[PDB]
Amino acid sequence: SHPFDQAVVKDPTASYVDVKARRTFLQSGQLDDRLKAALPKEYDCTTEATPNPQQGEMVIPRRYLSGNHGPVNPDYEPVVTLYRDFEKISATLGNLYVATGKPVYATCLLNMLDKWAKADALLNYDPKSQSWYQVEWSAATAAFALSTMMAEPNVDTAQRERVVKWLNRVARHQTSFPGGDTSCCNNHSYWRGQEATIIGVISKDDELFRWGLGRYVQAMGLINEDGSFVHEMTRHEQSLHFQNYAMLPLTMIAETASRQGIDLYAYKENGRDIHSARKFVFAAVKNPDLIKKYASEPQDTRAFKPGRGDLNWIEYQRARFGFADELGFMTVPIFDPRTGGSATLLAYKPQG
Ligand SMILES: O=C(O)C1=C[C@H](O)[C@H](O)[C@H](O[C@H]2[C@H](O)[C@H](O)[C@H](O[C@H]3[C@H](O)[C@H](O)[C@H](O[C@H]4[C@H](O)[C@H](O)[C@H](O)O[C@@H]4C(=O)O)O[C@@H]3C(=O)O)O[C@@H]2C(=O)O)O1
């Protein structure tokens, strides 16, 4: 199938960032204003009311009024709010655990997840509905936060175990569906890939892990000569948006895999790799004529402004590669639950 089909999970506690080293850095290192701005605010999470899971069938309206672009369905947002709160709190607690090392944040995360697990949340839905997508985002969000505390001894370990098993079932069920002519292969495929990768790690499920790495391999084969993703260039006014969107899960799969000794960044297909796609995002934002080759609509550029969660992937890549912030977007801190919370907090290092 692919070059990583014998890969195994070596360390289920390794997470998607070196938690101990990063914490040490946050507590002893010379922080700039940006990093200080990114420190999460402590609070007493033991008294906080967290979202309750939906009873029974997960029903979520379609996102787009019609098609896969244009105006948004007015019924969508009020419904996915519950999920976005679940995501926000999760990622916030994970980041607080990393920054402070206090077990209380871990216990808070586990109590919320345990409640969702006991309800069999994220399991009952129509695979052809919007719900199937919502699961890929919410399950990865939770897993990323949980992955940072897999080594913590001061928690209810039995509860930690039920939650991991639940996540494993969620991801196995969610990724068992192939998708359509697009969702088999487009950014959704990559999002399922990040889900399978991180949950495969924390649950020591080699097969889920391999399936997730396979999604990254699939993506590299769908990059045009210019660095554009084939399926993202069919989205009309959201083409540029979706080109960027695709980078989010691809980057987390690569970051997660590097903690298990795999270097997905180095992987390429016919001389094309993730760096080509980065270069194209940067170029096309400076010069949107580039997109005209694929779409004639004026591009929606809501994702391209300082502080947008959509830019979180830049935090991880620039930490690792050292390239230049050519668009001048890395000013304020970035926070995105679906890619592990604040990549500023977790990856960004000030530069001499
Ligand atoms: O990050 C911010 O700073 C931020 C500020 C704004 O106030 C607002 O909160 C904004 O919200 C984001 C939200 O955080 C998610 O990122 C949301 O994500 C979208 C994503 O942009 C795509 O539109 C995605 O598209 C799907 C679609 O849902 C269907 O599944 C379709 O069939 O396939 C596509 C696809 O190919 O992926 O849906 C996501 C979603 O609905 O969660 O976007 C909002 C936002 O409005 O930008 O962030």
Describe the secondary structure blueprint for this structure.
Elements: H1 19-28, H2 33-38, H3 76-100, H4 103-118, H5 130-146, H6 157-175, H7 187-202, H8 206-220, H9 239-258, H10 274-286, H11 289-292, H12 312-321, H13 343-347
Helix pairs in contact: 3-4, 3-5, 4-6, 5-6, 5-7, 6-7, 7-8, 7-9, 8-9, 9-10, 9-12
Bound molecules: a molecule of 4 linked components (BEM-BEM-BEM-MAW).
The secondary structure category is mainly alpha
Name the CATH homologous superfamily: Chondroitin AC/alginate lyase
CATH topology type: Glycosyltransferase
Shape, per Cα inertia axes: globular
Number of strands: 0
Per CATH, the architecture is Alpha/alpha barrel
Instruction: Look at the structure and give the CATH class.
Output: Mainly Alpha
Tally the helices: 13
Helix content estimate: 40-55%
What integer value in Å does the Rg equal? 19 Å
Count of the separate structural domains: 1
How much of the sequence is in beta strands? Answer: under 5%
Bound molecules: a molecule of 4 linked components (BEM-BEM-BEM-MAW)
PDB class: lyase
Keywords: alpha barrel, polysaccharide lyase, Alginate, lyase
Assembly: monomeric
Entry title: Alginate lyase A1-III Y246F complexed with tetrasaccharide
Question: In a few lines, what is going on in this structure?
Answer:
This protein has 13 helices and no strands.
